[PDB]
Every structure is written in structure tokens, then in C-alpha cells.
Write a protein that binds this DNA or RNA. Structure first.
Ligand SMILES: Nc1ncnc2c1ncn2[C@@H]1O[C@H](COP(=O)(O)OP(=O)(O)O)[C@@H](O)[C@H]1O
Ligand SMILES: Nc1ncnc2c1ncn2[C@@H]1O[C@H](COP(=O)(O)OP(=O)(O)O)[C@@H](O)[C@H]1O
Ligand SMILES: Nc1ncnc2c1ncn2[C@@H]1O[C@H](COP(=O)(O)OP(=O)(O)O)[C@@H](O)[C@H]1O
Ligand SMILES: [Mg+2]
Ligand SMILES: [Mg+2]
Lengths: 190, 257, 45, 259, 255
DNA sequence: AGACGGCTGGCACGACTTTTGCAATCGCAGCCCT
DNA sequence: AGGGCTGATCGTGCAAAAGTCGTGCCAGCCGTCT
């Protein structure tokens, strides 16, 4: 549901709308008509932004319902072109106006780009993403000895066991993205 | 994972075919068929796609018949921009339809031999033959076929070049004839009786006379499943039929008075 | 199929383009911009 | 330089010598033609020459001859766009125009229209550019590749192929060792495909080859040279069985109804 | 504007015909088999024509787009359903006294034939949706591989084309007919080839097979001559590569 | 008491995104310039 | 008295140069057991 209270409403001054036609002066009427045209263009722009946002949001929530329900660990690889193809979303107006949209859902507060998760490989016609990988790596590092955290190689093994097949290079890279100490640096005396 | 919908495939050979499909399911290669008429083959193809349970949609579903002009199935490998007249942006379609998927080849034998050659040329290397000047692009997707057409016959005919014919040789399926299947036929008959009673939500499944099932057997039954589905609604068409069992099955839509 | 005659629009640039560019902005970015714009117009509410 | 053959499914009999001749012929860019049978390594030979696309910048251009439908095929030759056709768009040059200098792999279909082949041949002979319009042909060199899948001088007698196009074509042929001819790595490339199949299956281990199976392999007419051999290889691999039996039954004719 | 002269007395007389015609702009035909080099001679006339600094550039008759035939010689001015652009005239409009060798005339549509039959009319260039035609003088020239009378008995080209036939189509002598500098032509072709072959010189050389090649079909005067020359050379590629046992049989099964 | 070893982050290339920078010739007819 | 010339209107994209991530890749380093 679009935040209609957070959705501004553009009202036209109807008193000016009734005070211009009677203007026997052409300059006042022309200025009023130009102002009305500009205001109508602006209001239509805001409304089109809202409507396209609602449509793409429905498409993403359909795509990210698994991300909405199970969470970032089950965040599917979501892209604009795929979403635009899936929901018949704008081919370029969407790419423009996609910036700065936020949503409150059972998962929490999520950005517009936060809904779209990157693409990662999965065999057997399955598919994989990025936020999924981040949450899975967080769990795997949690599923490590308190004295010895999970290795980036161990994280790669865990990802491959999950079928993610992140491999050690992306495993270390995402652990850097997750900003956690891996095995030989998170090592602590038991 | 995802479970394929129930199919009345009670033939023991049908179970065997299902098993063969099951073995092939982890595999990923061409899948052809003998295309028995009135026989619900691409339903089995879907059960395959379902058996694969691939993420996203790999169960493309398009025939060849509507591709009357060569351009149509030609546009199964669509157009990019401005080749001929661009009626809409990125005329490409039906190709990425199984982006990471598989293709269902229906009405395949009717396809143009030039069209067939184009398809085969796509098969191995995977190059995107987009009409209009551009660069190709592969995609890891598959294909599958099912047709009453006799492949050895067409090879004698040379309707498609032999290269493609062999290129397709990775999994065959000879569906049993409608006149071949009898016990499964009556089983699915009761099944469709119940299924109609459900979908229409009519208060009572009327039943059918023993004479009703016997006469339906005496019916031509050219399509074991496709004809049966039409007969199902044909009896469902009758009003008050649900209240009491009746043998009123409407074969001919043109039948009247 | 082939080629011969037949076949046949366009968008707008600058003013419509500026209006569209206003929407790619943030929510409160659009709100403050709307306030600043409504500061001028004598025919809006 | 030299790039490792990603596949060298080659015949020690004379496709060794054939490959040697190809390597000798490779450096120049003059007319390049081949010859072969239904599914007889000829795409693989195309890859051979594409590796033999010497140095770098080997722009692989494919000419799937029996494609292009009917109508705009003409444009696919030359170049679309301008305001020409039912549309207007930027200069999508013809497929030959699209690749400048590239490798022109002929699909050995033998086009039904000699004039259409002749129009391609005139552009193939030289490119003077199309400064008038993209409807025309342009000023492009390209490596060019041909092959044979049928009887050339017969069609010359059969009038199927224009003599002038034939005279320009086949400056140096490349025939192929058939399944009825090559017959060299039959068991060798056989187990090669077998290992590929096992690795694809992630298979435990190769059960082996039956002497009856090997005898059948020798006896095979092999209607398709390269692939159909690999085809039956895949056929047996899918047929599969216990690791106890090295090989079972014949996969030469999958078409045959399953027992 | 020259090449590896076949060095023939017939060639001498044909060149004489060309030179006699040189100033003239009359439409011209030719019936030359592949390797004849009549096109090369034609363009040699074009550069050597009275209009030495003239716009002389052919366009294969087979080229034209199925519907663009009007858009072939004439060129788009206004409308045409494009809805934009289409303001560029034809390369034939781009001619104006210049040359466009009517190659491939052996196969153009009877439709193409009649449209050109209009082009055979003196001047009057009409374009799409036009106001006033253009009487644009242009030099006409063509060559064919076959017999104009043969087509005529077939009726293949309308006799309008025969009217379009204007200048006496000189014809290239057959390979068996030409037989002029076969060793010398081989010598020049092989000089060029070894240049391309980058080998030093033909230490083998020899000429018994040169006379053997004098007993050759030679279907293409330059199409096959040099073609087989290079075929044999590349099969050799060695310095000591003589005229002995070098065959022209690329289709044939070598051993 | 120096090498193993995984860290761990620097470095890399393309691959997906992306933001901005972009408006006309109409249309007559009267007015201005010549 | 004749030519120039004028714009009042003419509005949901894209494209383009740029950037930026994914994943890899690589190089030194420290705990330690040798
Ligand atoms: N298990 C099933 N459930 C629902 N519909 C079915 C089932 N099996 C077959 N059908 C129906 O039968 C019709 C034709 O089936 P089929 O004979 O496979 O087609 P074809 O004539 O191409 O072989 C299809 O429209 C399909 O809806
Ligand atoms: N070593 C190999 N590596 C890859 N593919 C091979 C190999 N040996 C045989 N094949 C297969 O055999 C076939 C070669 O024949 P191909 O060139 O496709 O047929 P055609 O000659 O009709 O064009 C292909 O299907 C190819 O994949
Ligand atoms: N006098 C010549 N010197 C060198 N090469 C020639 C000569 N005449 C013809 N050729 C060769 O003939 C080829 C052109 O073929 P051509 O004879 O024009 O075919 P056609 O006559 O059927 O149009 C060119 O590659 C050219 O090298
Ligand atoms: Mg069917
Ligand atoms: Mg010629």
C-alpha cells in the first residue's frame, strides 16, 4: 500500500481558476493559463511517479515476498530489467525514478534498490543472489567456534553446501562486505 | 520440491515412461516424443519441467501452427530494433522466455525446413540469431519435443535436414494410443467426473451408468484425454445431470435437435 | 513481412524532461521542492 | 600464436594429415573452402580454422545459409536502416557488412537462388563501399570460410551451383575423412566421449567396453560421422547400468523401440 | 588504369575497340565468362573515358532490394511512408554522365528490365511523389556471361533491352581461344603469388607442365588460371617447386 | 624459529546500472525590414 | 510596394558516458610447530 499520507497532494487554487477567465486583460489570463499548465504537468509528474512506484513495488513484493517473508537469507536475485520484463515496468522511466524508495514490511525497512538482489549462480535450474549470500555468511560465521571463526574457505564450503557455490574469492570478498573477522583473525583463546 | 499435478497414467508402460522421465530429469538433453493425438503429452512435458523444479520459468509452452508466416516462429528468435518496422521496442521474445530453461516443441513437424535449420543452428552453439544487425548471445536453456510425426518417415522425406534430426536424438517418448489405453481410460473417466463435480461445485456428482461407461467405450475416443475433457464438460453442459447419474455425453458439438 | 510503404510518434524534451527528472529524486526531496515551487504559484493549493 | 585445441577429436589416419594441411594453409586469408558429410566434424573444422584465425582479432562471423527466411534476407546481406524499410533505425549493416575483416563461415547449404549467392559473391569478390546508401554494400575485407556437404561438380553439371560462383569458390578445398573413411580414433575418441560423459554424469567410474560392443562399433555404418558417434555414446551413457558390466546392448540405434 | 595484360592480339583488337570507343558515351554491352576481366577493361575505359574525372562506379544488377527498385536508380525525396528523412536521391541519380557498369544484367527482373527500359528513355528521372522529372545524362555500360540472342529466343530479356543494347559488345576470347601468354601470364601471376607467398622465387619453375596446362580446360581466364596457380603453389610453397605434377583439381580427389 | 595457511584486504576486469542532458517546428499574417 | 520573419504550441526516455559491483586473484603476515 502506497504511503498516501506521505504521498503529497497537489491542489489547484480554484479561486484563481475562477478569477482568470473573467479577466478582461489577456496578459493575466495567459500567465494564469501558463501557470495552470505548469502546475498540471507537475501534478501529473508526481502522480505518474507514484503510480509507477506502486506497480513496480507490487512486482518486487511478488518477487521479494520470499525476501519479505523468510528474509534476506532467502532474498532472490532481483533485477530491474527482469522486474520490468516480469511486471511490464517502465523500460527507462523506471530506471530513472527508481532512486530513493523505502518500504516498511514484516522484514523491516528496506530501500528500493535493497529489494533488488544481485545474481549468483545455482545449478539444477535454481538461482542465487547477493543478500542471500550475506545473510548466509553471517549465519555460517555464527556457526563457527567462538575461539575459531569460519574460514573464508570454510565459508565457501558452507555456501557450496547450501548450493550457492560462492567459492573462496567471493566468500572472502563478501565477508569483507559483511565486515567480520575470519578464522585466522577472529581467532581467540578459548 | 515442487510436485507435478496428478495424471491418470495407469498404463504400466506409462509408469515405465514416467520412470524414464524421472531418470532423465536430473539429466538435461533433448527430449522428443511420438506425439500420440488426443493424449495430453505436454502435460507430461510439464511434469518434466516440474520434475526439474528449476528456479524461474523453464517450462516454455508454444507450438508451431500459429507461426503461419515464417516470420512468427522466426520471431521465436525475435527482433531487436528496427528490422522491418519496429512496431514495439525490443521485439525479442519467446527466446528469453526460458532464460535458463527449456523449449517445448509442439507442432514441430509443420515448421519450415529453413525455420528448422535456423532452430538447429541455434541448438548447439546457442548463438542469438536476432533479426537485424547485432551480435549473438547464448543462454543455458534446453528444449523438448512431442509429435505424432514419424521421424524415420520425415527423414525419408527429408522435411528437416538429418543433422537436426540426430541433434534432437536424446530422449524419445511413444505415448500409448487412445485406443491403446482402456483401464486408465475409465479411471480417468471417473476422475474427470469427480473433477468436474468439484470445479463446477455442482451439489452432486451424478455418477454414470455401467451402460454409460460402456457406451463411452463404444465411442470413437480419438483423443484419450483431449476428447475425454470435451466429453466431461459435454455431460456437465446438461442441466440437472449432476442430481442423477446420466449417460448423456455430448460427442458432436454440431449434433443438434 | 517484406518492405514497401505503410508504417508510422515522439516524446518531449526539456520541460517534460525536467518534470520527469524531478521524480527520480527522493521523497522529502520532492516534498521540499514542491514547497519551494508552491511558494510561487498563485493558482495552486 | 597457438591456442590449445579445446577439442582435438582428430583422426590419426589422415585427419592428422588433414589438420597439418589446414595448418599450412592457415596463415593467408585467401579463399577458404572445406568439404564433408552430414555431421562430419565440419563445424569442428570450422572451430579449427577459427583457432587458425591467426593472431588476434579473429571476428567469427557465421553465415547460416538456410536461414534468413525469405524477404529481409536481402538486407541481411547488405544493410538495413536509413529510412529504407518499413521502419527507420540506425545503420545495422548487412551481416557481411557488420563484420569487417572477420571470418566468414559459410554454411554449406547451397542456396536455392543462384542470383542471391551471386550478389553475395560480387560483394565477396571486393567491397567498394555504399556511400550512396546502406541499402548497398560497403568497403570491407573479411576472412572467409566455406565447406562442402554435397557433390560439387555434379551440381555444376546439375546446374544447381553457378560455375562462376564455383570458380571463385574452392580455390583450395578441404575434404573430410568420413565415418566410412576416418575410422581412426573410433575406440579412442569413443572412450574420450565416454570419459566426458562420466564426468558430466559426475559418474563413479567407467564400467568399460564390451567386446561385443566394440565389435558392433567396428560394424557400425555410422550414418553420421562425428556427432552420431557421440550421439550413440550419449545413448549408451543414458542407457547406463551397473558398474559390474563394462558395456551392455547397442546404443547405435536409439530410435529403435526400447526392449 | 591497367592490369596484367593477357597480352593477346585478340586482346589487342579488343583494346582497339575500347580505345576507338573511348570518348563515346554510348550504352555498351559485353558477353564475358568469369576470368575474362571485361569488367576491369570496362572500368579501364571508364577512367580512360572522355570523362576522365568522371564519377564511374558500378552497381550489381542483382543488388537491388525487392521493393526499392524505384528507390534503386532514383532516390528517396519526400514521403514514401518513411515519415522522416528519405531526402537522398539515387546513386543512379548520383551518376550524371558518370559510369555504373551494369554487371549482373544477365539476371535482373523482367520488372527490373522494364523499369530500366524507362531508364533507357532519354532523361526524365522521376522520384516518389515527384514534381518534375530529371533529364540526367549518364554513361551506360554492361556485361553478361551469356548470349543476348539466346535470351532473346527465350525472350529472357525483353527486346527493349536489345534496344538498350547500343555499343558493339566486344567479347573476351575463350581460354582455349586466348592461349596467348599462358607461360607469361603464369609468370606474372606467380610473381604476385610468391610475393604473397613471401617465398623468395620459384627455383623449381620448369615449363613442361606449362605446356600441360596449355592442355587445360582453363574455365576461368583469370578466375582459374591464377586460382590453380596459387593452389599448386601453396601445395608446394617450397623454393624448388617446378612445373611437374602440379594439378588443378581442388574438387578432385588428390593422393 | 621459519614455513604453512588462511586472512585479508589490495587489485583486477568486465557486467549491470545509471543520470543527465537533452524541445521542437508549427502557423499565418501582420508587422518589421527592405 | 515587396520580402523576412516571427513564433504564439509543439510534454513519461533514453542513452552514454560513467560508474560500480562480483568474483576473482594475489601478496604479505602472523600463530605455531616444527
Ligand atoms: N492430467 C491432465 N490434466 C488436465 N488436462 C489434461 C491432462 N492430460 C491431458 N490433458 C488435456 O488434454 C489436452 C490434449 O492433450 P494431448 O493429447 O497431450 O495433446 P496432443 O494432442 O498435442 O498430444 C490438453 O489440452 C490437456 O489440457
Ligand atoms: N572432440 C569433440 N569435441 C566436441 N564435439 C565433438 C567432438 N567429436 C565429435 N563432436 C560432435 O560431433 C559433431 C561434429 O559434427 P558437426 O560439425 O556438428 O556436423 P556437420 O558436419 O553436419 O556440420 C558435433 O555434434 C560435435 O559436438
Ligand atoms: N588483364 C588482366 N590482368 C590481370 N587480371 C585480370 C585481367 N583480366 C581479368 N583479370 C582477373 O579476372 C578477375 C575478374 O573476373 P572477371 O573476368 O571480371 O569475371 P566476369 O568477366 O565473369 O565478370 C579479377 O580478379 C582479375 O584479377
Ligand atoms: Mg498433439
Ligand atoms: Mg564476374
Amino acid at each position: 500500500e502506497l504511503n498516501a499520507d506521505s504521498i503529497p497532494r497537489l491542489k489547484i487554487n480554484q479561486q484563481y481558476a475562477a478569477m482568470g477567465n473573467s479577466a478582461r486583460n489577456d496578459a493575466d489570463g495567459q500567465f494564469i493559463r501558463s501557470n495552470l499548465q505548469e502546475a498540471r504537468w507537475l501534478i501529473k509528474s508526481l502522480e505518474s511517479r507514484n503510480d509507477t512506484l506502486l506497480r513496480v513495488s507490487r512486482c518486487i513484493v511478488e518477487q521479494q515476498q520470499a525476501f519479505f517473508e523468510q528474509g534476506e537469507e532467502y532474498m532472490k536475485p532481483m533485477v530491474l530489467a527482469d522486474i520490468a520484463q516480469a511486471v511490464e515496468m517502465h523500460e527507462s522511466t523506471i530506471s530513472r525514478v527508481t532512486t530513493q524508495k523505502y518500504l516498511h514490511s514484516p522484514r523491516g525497512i528496506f530501500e528500493l534498490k535493497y529489494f533488488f538482489s544481485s545474481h549468483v549462480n545455482t545449478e539444477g535450474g535454481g538461482e542465487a543472489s547477493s543478500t542471500a549470500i550475506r545473510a548466509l555468511v553471517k549465519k555460517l560465521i555464527a556457526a563457527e567456534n567462538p575461539a575459531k571463526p569460519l574460514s573464508d574457505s570454510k565459508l565457501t564450503s558452507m555456501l557450496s553446501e547450501q548450493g550457492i557455490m560462492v567459492a573462496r574469492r567471493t566468500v572472502a570478498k563478501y565477508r569483507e562486505s559483511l565486515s567480520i573477522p575470519p578464522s585466522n583473525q577472529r581467532k581467540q583463546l578459548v | 520440491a515442487e510436485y507435478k499435478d496428478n495424471l491418470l497414467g495407469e498404463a504400466n508402460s506409462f509408469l515405465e515412461v514416467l520412470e524414464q522421465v524421472s531418470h532423465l530429469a536430473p539429466l538435461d538433453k533433448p527430449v522428443l516424443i511420438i506425439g500420440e493425438r488426443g493424449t495430453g503429452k505436454e502435460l507430461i512435458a510439464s511434469r518434466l519441467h516440474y520434475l526439474s523444479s528449476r528456479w524461474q520459468g523453464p517450462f516454455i509452452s508454444l507450438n508451431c501452427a500459429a507461426l503461419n508466416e515464417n516470420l512468427l516462429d522466426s520471431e521465436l528468435f525475435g527482433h531487436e530494433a528496427g528490422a522491418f518496422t519496429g512496431a514495439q521496442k525490443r521485439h525479442p521474445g519467446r527466446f528469453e522466455r526460458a532464460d535458463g530453461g527449456t523449449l517445448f516443441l509442439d507442432e514441430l513437424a509443420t515448421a519450415p525446413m529453413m525455420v528448422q535449420e535456423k532452430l538447429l543452428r541455434v541448438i548447439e552453439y546457442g548463438e542469438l540469431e536476432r533479426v537485424g544487425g547485432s551480435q549473438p548471445l547464448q543462454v543455458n536453456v534446453r528444449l523438448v519435443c512431442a509429435t505424432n510425426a514419424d521421424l524415420p518417415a520425415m527423414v525419408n522425406e527429408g522435411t528437416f535436414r538429418a543433422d537436426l534430426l540426430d541433434r534432437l536424438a536424446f530422449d524419445v517418448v511413444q505415448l500409448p494410443p487412445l485406443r491403446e489405453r482402456e483401464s486408465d481410460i475409465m479411471l480417468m473417466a471417473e476422475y474427470f467426473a469427480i473433477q468436474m463435480c468439484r470445479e463446477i461445485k455442482l451439489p452432486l456428482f451424478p455418477g454414470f451408468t455401467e451402460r454409460a461407461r460402456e457406451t463411452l467405450l463404444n465411442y470413437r475416443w480419438p483423443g484419450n484425454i483431449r476428447e475425454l475433457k470435451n466429453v466431461v464438460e459435454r455431460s456437465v453442459y446438461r442441466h440437472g445431470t449432476s442430481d442423477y447419474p446420466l449417460d448423456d455425453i455430448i460427442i458432436d458439438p454440431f449434433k443438434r435437435r | 513481412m517484406k518492405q514497401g510503404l505503410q508504417l508510422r510518434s515522439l516524446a518531449m524534451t526539456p520541460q517534460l524532461q525536467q518534470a520527469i527528472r524531478l521524480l527520480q529524486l527522493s521523497t522529502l526531496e520532492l516534498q521540499q521542492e514542491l514547497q519551494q515551487a508552491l511558494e510561487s504559484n498563485p493558482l495552486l493549493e
